């Protein structure tokens, strides 16, 4: 099947992934309130163009 | 946390086949030792010997150094810790001072200076060393009586008269009514025959709702009497309640 299932990206031991819990975040620069997480939220591989 | 089974024994003459067995449950059979002890009415509680099922080391008292033989069997597992074995004892040279109940009791723990001290005990097998011949039990039914007119309590049971040797078992409804039961000791008459009584206490309002079947079982004579005790009484202090 080609169904895009939610895939999470987790880090090895001795590594970390930083989640920017900022509503009005434009992607770049100092994110004021930061949290830390091992795995990302469920991101499914929906592949498309213009949308 | 398991209970050890002890095997009831025949009355025996100064010469006859002698053995008593003992079964186990709920423990690791080869760790704990096995101690034997016998309580007669003339010399008190006396320790006989002990034996370990794993090694097989028996240490006996010098009073049984040449007439008692002890034996252990092989373990039959159930789980990784619990198991089920058995052990026998044959006491030869049957004197009359041997008359009286006797027991099995296993050790307390597996190691130490107190490895074998008997922690877990058994039920009790009774001897009667006697040339006297076996006699069956005369099971009579006992009439209920008034224990309290204001509270509404009565009592009814069975009477086991003229049996030899000890003991005689008495159950109820094949094991249904165990609450309120009181069995009395047997006295030995001037002839050689015992007699005991037994009475369970049950309420007076139960007439056609419960069946009362006293099951007197005597093993040395191979007899099982199933007496039906009548719930209708003859006391003038309980008739006020019916």
């Amino acid at each position: 099947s080609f169904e895009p299932i939610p895939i999470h990206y987790c880090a090895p031991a001795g590594f970390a992934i930083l989640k920017c819990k900022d509503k009005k975040f434009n992607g770049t620069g100092p994110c004021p309130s930061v949290s830390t997480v091992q795995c990302t939220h469920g991101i499914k591989p929906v592949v498309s163009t213009q949308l | 946390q398991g209970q050890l089974v002890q095997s009831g024994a025949e009355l025996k003459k100064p010469g006859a086949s002698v053995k008593i067995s003992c079964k186990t449950s709920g423990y690791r059979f080869n760790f704990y030792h096995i101690n034997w002890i016998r309580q007669t009415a003339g010399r008190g509680p006396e320790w006989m010997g002990w034996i370990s099922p794993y090694s097989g080391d028996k240490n006996l008292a010098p009073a049984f150094q040449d007439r008692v033989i002890m034996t252990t069997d092989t373990e039959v597992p159930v789980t990784s810790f619990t198991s089920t074995g058995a052990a026998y004892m044959e006491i030869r040279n049957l004197k009359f001072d041997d008359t009286g109940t006797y027991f099995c009791a296993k050790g307390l723990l597996r190691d130490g200076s107190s490895t074998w001290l008997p922690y877990l005990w058994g039920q009790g097998t009774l001897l009667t060393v006697s040339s006297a011949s076996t006699k069956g039990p005369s099971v009579f039914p006992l009439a209920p009586s008034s224990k309290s007119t204001s509270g509404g309590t009565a009592a009814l049971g069975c009477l086991v008269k003229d049996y030899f040797p000890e003991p005689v078992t008495v159950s109820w409804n094949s094991g249904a009514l165990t609450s309120g039961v009181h069995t009395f000791p047997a006295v030995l008459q001037s002839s050689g025959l015992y007699s005991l009584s037994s009475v369970v206490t049950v309420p007076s309002s139960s007439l056609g709702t419960q069946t009362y079947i006293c099951n007197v079982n005597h093993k040395p004579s191979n007899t099982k009497v199933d007496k039906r005790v009548e719930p209708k009484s003859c006391d003038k202090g309980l008739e006020v309640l019916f």
């Binding site: - | 008190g44 509680p45 006396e46 320790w47 010997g49 002990w50 240490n59 006996l60 008292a61 027991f103 307390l108 130490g112 200076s113 107190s114 490895t115 001290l117 008997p118 922690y119 005990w121 058994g122 039920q123 009790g124 009579f140 006992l142 009439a143 009586s145 224990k147 009477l159 008269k161 009181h182 009395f184 000791p185 047997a186 006295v187 008459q189 001037s190 007699s195 005991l196 009584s197 009475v199």
Partner: protein, 213 residues
């Protein structure tokens, strides 16, 4: 036996009591250990104290003991009613066998009595077609456990065919006994009413059957 306890001992309720366990140097207490069992007569015992002071599994912290170089002692604090029974010590080692003592009967004082509930039974109809006659005189629910049964043939003391059990402790922490009379049906026949006497602490309770009725 070679190990000697005390004859008996008493102690009130909510109080303590001691029991001694002494003997010669061949059994106690140099290079020996002591254990303590609550052994109700006719019932299976219960290990109380092992290795001279260590309470067996499940044994309440009320009990304790101690060993001197010549005698050991048991102590039951906050004395309970059911504790009124026989108690046995023993001196053991790792190698040799264990030898019991002589026996101590604990007389817990300060306990309410109960009047005996006696009941006498005449010969049955199947026993009079046998033909036998046995008077069954049951005693129960008395405390303390000491009663004396005397029979009288039409208000005349009989000295033939007296059956008497010793008093035994029930499951409700009382005592009970059972007497009988084994005389011919004609031994009572001439005697128009037969009784059963139960003396208890002076107070005597008696029950008579009138076999004319």
């Amino acid at each position: 036996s070679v190990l000697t306890q005390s004859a008996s001992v008493s102690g009130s309720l909510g109080q303590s009591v001691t029991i001694s366990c002494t003997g010669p140097n061949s059994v106690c207490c140099s290079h020996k250990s002591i254990s303590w069992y609550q052994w109700p007569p006719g019932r299976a015992p219960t290990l109380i104290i092992y290795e001279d002071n260590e309470r067996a599994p499940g044994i309440s912290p009320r009990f304790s003991g101690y060993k001197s170089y010549w005698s050991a002692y048991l102590t039951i604090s906050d004395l309970r009613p059911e504790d009124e029974t026989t108690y046995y010590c023993c001196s053991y080692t790792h190698n040799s066998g264990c030898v019991f003592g002589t026996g101590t009967k604990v007389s817990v004082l300060g306990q309410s009595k109960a009047n005996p509930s006696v009941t006498l039974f005449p010969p049955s109809s199947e026993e009079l077609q046998a033909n036998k006659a046995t008077l069954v005189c049951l005693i129960s629910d008395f405390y303390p456990g000491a009663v004396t049964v005397a029979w009288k043939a039409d208000s005349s003391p009989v000295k033939a065919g007296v059956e008497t059990t010793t008093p035994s402790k029930q499951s409700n922490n009382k005592y009970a006994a059972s007497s009988y009379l084994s005389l011919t049906p004609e031994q009572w026949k001439s005697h128009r009413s037969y009784s059963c006497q139960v003396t208890h602490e002076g107070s005597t309770v008696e029950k008579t059957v009138a076999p004319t009725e």
